[PDB]
Structure 1
Amino acid sequence: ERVVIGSKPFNEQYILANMIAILLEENGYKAEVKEGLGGTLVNYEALKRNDIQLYVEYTGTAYNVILRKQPPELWDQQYIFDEVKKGLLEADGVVVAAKLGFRDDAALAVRADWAEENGVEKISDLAEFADQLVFGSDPEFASRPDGLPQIKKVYGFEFKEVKQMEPTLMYEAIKNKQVDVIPAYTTDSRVDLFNLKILEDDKGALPPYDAIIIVNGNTAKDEKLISVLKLLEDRIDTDTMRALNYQYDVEKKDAREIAMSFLKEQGLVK
């Protein structure tokens, strides 16, 4: 039959929606992609209605926006994954078909050369350096329920100073060494373009956003289709997703051709 695939309006989603479409067509299905159908709830309600049969959601996003659940004291990856799986199934019969293998998290980033020289890889590594470092911030990060005050509480440090600025000036500020630490999304191509290092939230101050393929109840009962989606299980790590986003954002490549190239390299199409 025909499988309709939703997506949210940004790079990663255009690439992943097309990837699933191509893979399904390779395995005998007819697939349609609705590129930038809408945001989280446009897609989720479309999924419940069976106007679409699947899309790529994120665990923390499902936890907060869809299920409207209470933040835990500390964010644990699998706790949130299991709560989302149970929650979507009980409420709507929606099934988690696959974990893709990457998280698209709000995180902290620093310059990569400095991180290398000092062996900084996690937020807890910043402890001894914190009171010497300048933190760059925007309205988007400051408005978050989990932010700098939660980082202080969990990690036990505060930065030298906080410089507020427009979100479009953040990477320039860290590149020009006006600030030393910025909020950045883990799969954002600019992390690589500005030679930054993303840090592990090793203590769980911030929410996890594991990328998952979710399917409606009726589509979940198609054993062949599920098997095909399972070929993407742990297929794409955060480094890999970011480099795919780089092809879109920096190299200006078409999202579908980015997906096609990946699938061919992985031997899943041809």
Structure 2
Amino acid sequence: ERVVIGSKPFNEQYILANMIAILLEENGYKAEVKEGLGGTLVNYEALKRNDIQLYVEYTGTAYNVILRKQPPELWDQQYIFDEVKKGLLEADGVVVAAKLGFRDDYALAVRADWAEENGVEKISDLAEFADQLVFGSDPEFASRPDGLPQIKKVYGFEFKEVKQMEPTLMYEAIKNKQVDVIPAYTTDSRVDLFNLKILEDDKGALPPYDAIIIVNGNTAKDEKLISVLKLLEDRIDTDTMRALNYQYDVEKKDAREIAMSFLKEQGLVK
């Protein structure tokens, strides 16, 4: 069988898509990573129509963006998981094959020297300044229901200007003062490297984003394939994902080679 794996445009998507490809290839499959489709909704549409067979999604995204479910009073990681697994199955036959073992959350970040000068530590501290700050979005956060609309609704403010750019460009943009705030990805060590400060989400606006492998209904009938995917259950924690991402964004290593090195070290390929 030919297995096509989707990807959103950033480090860990490339790495994990290649890591899954390698594992599937080791178990008799022909696997390929498909790049360039776009973001969340284009990948999920492609999965439903069988253009792709699986990709790496996140619980909070599936809940808010795909299932368009209503935020509960308090975010609970396992509740959101349980409802995404039920909800994806009920709606489109999509199966949650595995939990990878890490969260990659959106977290609002600013420059650390500015934050220290202004006593900013939490998102609600931004209220004073927000209408004078430029927001640098990735392709999705500005328009997603759990993005800037959710910050507006929960915290009661909007930024002065919104610019959108591909995910990896956010970190240099804020460092170089092209923007003042970004929805940094928490598995990206460029937050520390470029002297940025992640702010506490003190009013609990944003959900947990636990990485999960999702598979379309027809592909999931393949029990051998599902069981290869489950070899990765809980195997990748946040510090591991961050290390691998660094090898991609800073060391400029090829995603296939980063994945291959990890699989060998963990004994998943000999």
Q: Normalized against structure 1, the TM-score is what?
A: 0.74
Contact 2:10 2:167 in 1 (8 A): no
Shift of 1:134: 15
CA displacement 1:138-174 (0-9 Å, x = unmatched): 9998888668999999999999999999999986899
Aligned to 1:17: 17
Shift of 1:31: 0.7
Contact 1:10 1:36 in 2 (8 A): no
Shift of 1:205: 3.8
Other structure's SS at 2:224 match: helix
What is the aligned length? 270
Shift of 1:107: 2.2
Query: Residues 170, 11 of structure 1: CA spacing in aligned structure 2 closer, same or farther, 3 A cutoff?
Result: closer
Matches of 2:138 and 2:6, distance apart in 1: 30
Matches of 1:95 and 1:82, distance apart in 2: 12
Matches of 1:109 and 1:97, distance apart in 2: 32
Of the structure 1 ranges 100-109 and 191-200, higher mean CA displacement relative to structure 2 is found in 191-200
Aligned to 2:133: 133
CA displacement 1:29-60 (0-9 Å, x = unmatched): 11111123221122112111122111111111
Matches of 2:29 and 2:53, distance apart in 1: 13
Shift of 1:182: 7.4
Shift of 1:13: 0.8
Matches of 1:91 and 1:160, distance apart in 2: 38
Contact 1:89 1:95 in 2 (8 A): yes
Contact 1:59 1:211 in 2 (8 A): yes
Aligned to 2:113: 113
Query: Residues 113, 24 of structure 1: CA spacing in aligned structure 2 closer, same or farther, 3 A cutoff?
Result: farther
CA displacement 1:233-270 (0-9 Å, x = unmatched): 11111111111111111111111111111111111112
Aligned to 2:216: 216
Matches of 1:115 and 1:11, distance apart in 2: 27
Matches of 2:127 and 2:146, distance apart in 1: 18
Query: Residues 81, 177 of structure 1: CA spacing in aligned structure 2 closer, same or farther, 3 A cutoff?
Result: same
Question: What 5-or-longer segments of structure 2 have no aligned partner?
Answer: none
Query: Residues 199, 240 of structure 1: CA spacing in aligned structure 2 closer, same or farther, 3 A cutoff?
Result: farther
Query: Residues 155, 191 of structure 1: CA spacing in aligned structure 2 closer, same or farther, 3 A cutoff?
Result: same
Other structure's SS at 1:173 match: helix
Matches of 2:192 and 2:114, distance apart in 1: 15
Query: Residues 48, 178 of structure 1: CA spacing in aligned structure 2 closer, same or farther, 3 A cutoff?
Result: closer
Shift of 1:183: 5.2
Contact 1:14 1:36 in 2 (8 A): no
Question: What 5-or-longer segments of structure 1 have no aligned partner?
Answer: none
Matches of 1:36 and 1:196, distance apart in 2: 28
CA displacement 1:112-139 (0-9 Å, x = unmatched): 9999999999999999999999999999
Contact 1:100 1:235 in 2 (8 A): yes
Q: CA RMSD in A?
A: 4.7
Query: Residues 172, 105 of structure 1: CA spacing in aligned structure 2 closer, same or farther, 3 A cutoff?
Result: same
Contact 2:136 2:182 in 1 (8 A): yes
Give the fraction of aligned pairs with identical amino acids, expressed as a percent. 100
Of the structure 1 ranges 120-129 and 28-37, higher mean CA displacement relative to structure 2 is found in 120-129
Contact 2:65 2:146 in 1 (8 A): no
Query: Residues 44, 112 of structure 1: CA spacing in aligned structure 2 closer, same or farther, 3 A cutoff?
Result: same
Of the structure 1 ranges 39-48 and 129-138, higher mean CA displacement relative to structure 2 is found in 129-138
Shift of 1:74: 1.9
Contact 2:75 2:204 in 1 (8 A): yes
Contact 1:76 1:204 in 2 (8 A): no
Shift of 1:25: 0.6
Shift of 1:104: 1.1
Contact 2:142 2:149 in 1 (8 A): no
Of the structure 1 ranges 229-238 and 191-200, higher mean CA displacement relative to structure 2 is found in 191-200
Contact 1:74 1:203 in 2 (8 A): no
Query: Residues 205, 248 of structure 1: CA spacing in aligned structure 2 closer, same or farther, 3 A cutoff?
Result: same
Matches of 1:24 and 1:204, distance apart in 2: 38
